[PDB]
Amino acid sequence: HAYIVKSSPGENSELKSAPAQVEIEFNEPVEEGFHYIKVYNSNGDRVDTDKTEIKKDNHHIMTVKLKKNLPKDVYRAEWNAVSADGHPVSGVIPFSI
């Protein structure tokens, strides 16, 4: 199974300014089909603003752009990807502004 190595925002992090994106780095590459990061505010509204992209030169990295000037709130980045080894993986990265 692929595992998160690191993310920006980090899990349960408290940000100092509004982020432009959510970025996730996996220990092994992840595949194109069905990947996503969907980001929600605490009202359940979507705050990502673009389709999720696997980095063109690095299939370990997945990013999604965010709406500008997000307010102070608690957020949930819900992610899904298919591992290089075939296993579907998913999770949530909570963070706050």
Numbering used by the authors: 24 to 120
What's written in the study?
We purified the resulting YcnJCopC protein and crystallized it in its as-purified, apo form. The overall fold displays the typical β-barrel structure of a cupredoxin fold observed in other CopC proteins. Of those CopC homologs whose structures have been experimentally determined, YcnJCopC has the lowest RMSD with the Cu(II)-binding CopC protein from Methylosinus trichosporium OB3b. Another His and an Asp from a DxH motif provide a third coordinating nitrogen and a coordinating oxygen, respectively. Concurrently, in the absence of Cu, the two His ligands in YcnJCopC can engage in π–π stacking, as we observe in our crystal structure. Protonation of histidines also helps to stabilize these π–π interactions, so Cu binding may also destabilize π–π stacking.
The ycnKJI operon in B. subtilis encodes a suite of proteins implicated in Cu uptake and regulation, including the Cu-binding protein YcnI and the putative Cu importer YcnJ. Here, we demonstrate that one of the extracellular domains within YcnJ (YcnJCopC) binds Cu(II) in 1:1 stoichiometry with high affinity using a histidine brace motif.
